[PDB]
Every structure is written in C-alpha cells, then in structure tokens.
Symmetry: D2
Subunit: 223 residues, 4 copies
C-alpha cells in the first residue's frame, strides 16, 4: 500500500510518485483520484509529469488522500472489525464535518473524526483523540488488530506523519532530506537508496516538517 | 432523469434501454451494472445490453441500488437533504447499514424501506420510509419536502410508486407490450399503443396476476 | 464539438473552460488531459482546471481532442465526409516518422499527423493546407459530402494558430478577441469573426490574419 | 499474459475467470465483449457480469485489451512481435480493405487477428493464422528485433474453440488443456493437464479435442 509525501522546494509530482493531493496556488489542495494505476491512467501520468508542488501526498469514494478545507490526509492500515461497527463510527463524526463523509472506509472516518476533535488547531491532540475513540469501538465491537496506523497529513504549510499500533506490528514510515530535490520525503517504504539513508519513524511517534525543519515527538492515543 | 423497468417474457436489455441496470436472470439476487460514463459512450454497457436477456430488470439514466433480493431506483429528491443527512443515515436499522455505500437520498430511502420491512410488506414499508424522510425534511430541510417516483423489485414482482408533498410529482407511465409480451414502466414515454399514466398518490404492482394500482400515501 | 483556446498571461484553465485540454506550463511539450466523460462532472478534471495555471492552452468540448505530438498540439471541429469508407488510404498517407503517434481512428488525428508529415514543424500554414487538400481529395474520390469541414486550433508552445475552411458553404464558426481582464487572447468555436478561408496567428507580435486555400 | 478459454456445457464466467477482457457466446452468432483497463475483481461491473452471465464458449485474458472480436470471431494472444512499433504502419497496410474497419488500436495482437481474417480465417483457420504469422514474423526479421514471433492464441467462431502455440525461438508462452468432469467441458489455459507443445494447434468442437502440427 505504498504512500509518499513531500515538503520542500517544488518538484514534479512524478519525481516522487491511486491518488495525489497537492498544494500549489490555493490554500485548498488539488485532489486527483481514480481506480486506475499510475501506469494505466495517462491523465494521472500527464498531471504528475507536468504539475510542480512543494507539498503533496500520493498513495497506491474509497481512495486516499481525503481532503476537506485546507487539510488532506492518507492512511495505511486498518481498524479491526470496522464493518461490524461502521454505524457507530459514523455517528461519532461531528455534524460540521459529516457532509465530507462520502464513502465507507475507516480511513475517511479517522480523518473526519480528527477534524471533529480539533485537527485544525491541535493536530497531535486531535489525531490522538480520534484514534483512542476508534480503537475503543474496535475493542468493544471489532477484532484484532484494533488499530494499525501510519498516516500522512497536511494543512498546506506543515507536513505531518504519525505511526501507531495497538500491537507489535505497525505499517512502516521512513523519511529523509533530499539534497538533490531540496526538500523532505516521507514514505511507507524506502525508494532512492543511492543518496543517503532513510530514517525510520518508530511506532508511537509523530513527525512534523515545517518552517523549523523536521522534528519528532511522542505519540500515543489520548487518555 | 429517465428510467425504465420491465416485467414479462425475457428480452435483451437494449430492447428497452450516470447510468445503471439491475436485472434478474439465474440468481435470486439481481446482477447490478453501474458506471459514471454516458450510456451512449460505454462499449461494455453496450455489449451487456445487446447480449444479456432478462424478464425482470430496471435501468436508469448511481441507481439502481440492490441489497439481497431487492433492487430500487428513484427519481426526485428530499428537500434540503444535505442539511440532515446524518439524521437520515442514523435512522437506518443496524442490519441494513452495511449496504449504505454512498451519500444520496435515494439510497437512504431504499435502506429505510428495508428497515421498515420492505421484504414482507412493500407498500407499508415504503410508506413509512417516505413519512420519515418527509418528516425530517419538514423539520430540517426545505421544499419540496418529497418528490418521488420509484421502481423496485424482489425478482418476482415489479412495483412502482409516484408521490409528492406538493403539486409536482416526477412522472410514471406503464404499458403492456404485445411485441415483447411483457409490461414496461417508464418515467418518460419511449407506436404499438398508448402509455398509461400512473397518477400521483398511487402504487403499481406487476406480478403473476397482471398489473394493479392501489392508493399510496406516506 | 465546441472549443476554446487561450494565449497570454497565465490563468487557471477553468477561467476559459467527451472532453480534453492540452496546456503548456513548464515543458516544451504540452500537458494533455482527456476523457470520454461529461466534463461538467469529472472531479479530477475539476481539480486540474481549478488548480493548473497556463499561458497557452487548447480545450475541446484516443478519439478525444486535443491531440499532441512532440511540441505540437491540435484540435479540430468539423469532419471529413465518409472518412470510415477510406480510413486505410488516409492512414497510409501519414509519413513513417509520424505514424507512431497514430493512436486512434478519427479523421482529426489523421489531419494533425498528415500536417506534421507535410512539414507543420517548419511551415504551419502550407503543411495544414497540403494535409487538408489530400484528405479533401480522398473524400471526393471515396467518401461523401461534405468533403471537408474544419475549424482547427493548434500550437507549438509559443504560438497559437487557428484556421477555418470548408469545401462548401457551411464552416464551423471561429471567433477571437483580446481579454483585457485576463491579459491574453481568446479564440473560440462559438468578438472578431474569423471568416472562412482564413488562418489566424497569435504570438509575441500580436494577432494577424491571412488567406488560407488548401 | 495469462488467459483461460472454455468450451462445454454452459457455466458462469466466474467458474473459470493491470488489464482485462472476456468474450463470450450466448444468444447471438457474434460474441459479447467486455474489456477494461483495470484489475479484474476490482471492477464491480466485471464482478457482476462474471457472477451472473452463463456461457458454453468464452475466452478471458488477464483499444489494446484482448480479446478482439469481429463478425462471428474472437481472438486473444499472449506473446509479442519483436520491434513491432518500428514497423506498425507496414503491418496495418497488409490488412485487407474488408477488415480494416475493425482495426481500432495499435497492438500487434489485433493486427495478427485482422491479418488472419484477411488470410481466410472464416474458411481455413489453420492456414490463415499460419500465413498471418509468417507475414508478421518476416516483417519483424526485416524491421524489428528479436524475438520475431512468440504466440499462444485462443480463438473461436461460436461453435469451435481453437488454440495455437508457436515461437521463432526457444520460448513459447505456455498452453495446457483438460476436460473438467465437474463442469462437463474443456478448459484451455496459457501461463496459469495436457501440455500443448510448441508448433501445435488444438481444435475443440462437437467431435472432441484434437491436435495437429502447426508450422507457419
């Protein structure tokens, strides 16, 4: 389920790169998603070949990324047994953001729940709370594993990524500053291995890349 | 937003035929084909409609929706739906929530009807489903609160209904075709003979003992 | 098959927009987006036109226009009468160099590639003229009436061209003007009229019209 | 690059069934044709169709998607004509005027099919494919590269199922076939049992299965 994210000097989307969310001219991200693979979609291939962005998310409706207002979001993993409690997960979304609920995935819930929990002014705390809530519903109505999560998300100025699991397995996250691109890449699995090592983001951690550089912070579902 | 439904001796789907088609053939469930490409310009749909034969099918210019043995398509609207969509979704019984895959009012109607016992009481269950959505639109929506023409089936019987909270109701017509040897029900008249208009506040039932109309009100 | 083309200070594509768009931004070759899908409501198209900015693009409405090859793109409203009856002969006239670009089966794509075969890269006026005459003559011989109906917009990344010709009294319409608000030229299929039998040329020097007689 | 063909008492297409397509016979002398450019069992429509349509003769392959169909015939091909894009024009021009109208894409496989039709597939399936293959292989020798011809093909007219396996070198896409008592019909597969050896053609009809040497 490879994903990749970028924050730095603008590059062509392809130079990292189904679904892409990118920032360019607007505070809202452009969003492109279809059920065709990077290779079967000449439109996606043309966009990725022609559009440049200094902040974007890409990920191999129920396709990521998701976007609402200034924010976009993508997630690798699962909430265990989700289909057995989808209704209650849906019911937990605030009215304000419910209009953005367009498909039936757990990923989309996690995003809208994080918005409902204050993602706009408190991304760490809000994601932390949304995860606690969904993990609790999984423990109540679902199955193992209750929460497996690697996610990337942005407000169009800062790029975030978090990795967490209710057990010992967590979808992987790596990041590295590219001197050749002059910006940061964050990925589910390391690609370019000629230009320096990738730094693993450990489970239970949140990465923030913004005006100060890249910094990590402890991350666990809210008390 | 034209639709067409058929019940009688099997014909190729095209002999009647956003887009979709639900048809019964060899299984108690309907096959369901739907896509966002124009019917005119999707060659796969063309091949399906040119090659598949069926004695009970529904097609609609996404509808139809299908769950278990039932399928359902709907033309019209619930006024101001978007402003109370959460409340409508929360009214769906736990048992049918798994089938709610998009965000339309039409899909909620179908699943609310199933929740109200469509499987064993079609007339009553749709009546109750509509009164709930119209009620929610009165409270939280706008006018028109309910505009509805709908066709739906369990694979044995074809039903259609026409109802509206005001004076405009999306149209429904039906006709027995002697050349196909079956009934066609449509939203806009497709010669062989005239079409019969289903008036507002009526539900049509086509099964083993012909076609019959009866009063219908939420 | 209505179209619009733009040349001037970069705007969002949506500000002058089956379906397609060819646009130049950062490469000598154009971007090409095209699908068989009500423009009105393709969400991906909606994103692209809402977010991509360009100072030279063509938009229409493998068989969708525009077409692109190397630095050139091309778009056509009209028809070559009875084309289907002689498509083989028409494909045969495309030079070996350009046949690789022949991806679908329309008359429009054949015109573009025949024009490239006739030297569009160096002599846009004469090559399109020669390509139209060849296809019109094939229609006369093997096709049906109208033998040639054309309004076309096409570009090399620097210059925008449009032409209007017909073998009969009906020619798809072409109009143009300078948009002071956008600070660029708009050329459309539907203002100054570009009369039939004329080619228009828009570049760093302005707009100019000239006679065009396949 | 993977295909399956069936001939026998009708079954749901799924009881046999990136890029994808299926051609099936049911109620008409021409086949139905479904093909699309995304992964099978992702396309809910393909799912619906395979789960709901029954046929006693169909071809499925896992525009440029196979199968191809024209008149009563359908055809699919695993393999390649080496260097094809360098002489595509020359290949198209060898298609007879009568069949040119069916040339919709740019693949080598489509031209093989239409060249076989041009060479008399409707009356001589063995001879026509042999001649179509020799012409393309020689164009590859002349203008393309190696490998000049690799072919496993399945093709049908609605009544008979054919398969053929040939290569200009040591690698030929594989073909196996077997009678399935459960389904009561023949299954023929390429790159998933009796192996169809290279330089062989298989014919399955009302008389049974039979092989013959095939030497373009």
């Amino acid at each position: 389920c490879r994903w990749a994210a970028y924050h730095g000097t603008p590059i062509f989307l392809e130079d990292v790169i189904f679904g892409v969310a990118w920032y360019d001219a607007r505070p809202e991200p452009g969003l492109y998603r279809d059920v065709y693979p990077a290779w079967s979609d000449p439109n996606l291939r043309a966009v990725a070949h022609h559009v440049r962005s200094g902040l974007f998310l890409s990920h191999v409706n129920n396709c990521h990324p998701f976007a609402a207002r200034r924010w976009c979001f993508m997630h690798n993993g699962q909430v265990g047994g989700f289909e057995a409690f989808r209704k209650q997960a849906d019911m937990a979304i605030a009215d304000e953001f419910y209009t953005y609920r367009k498909g039936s995935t757990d990923s989309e819930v996690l995003f809208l729940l994080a918005l409902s929990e204050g993602l706009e002014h408190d991304p760490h705390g809000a994601l932390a709370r949304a995860i606690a809530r969904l993990e609790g519903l999984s423990r109540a109505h679902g199955t193992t594993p209750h929460m497996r999560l690697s996610a990337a998300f942005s407000d169009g100025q800062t790029l975030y990524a978090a990795r967490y699991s209710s057990d010992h397995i967590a979808p992987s996250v790596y990041y590295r500053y590219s001197h050749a691109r002059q910006g940061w890449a964050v990925v589910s699995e390391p690609l370019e291995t000629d230009e320096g090592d990738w730094t693993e983001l450990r489970p239970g951690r949140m990465l923030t890349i913004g005006a100060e550089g890249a910094a990590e912070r402890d991350f666990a579902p809210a008390d």
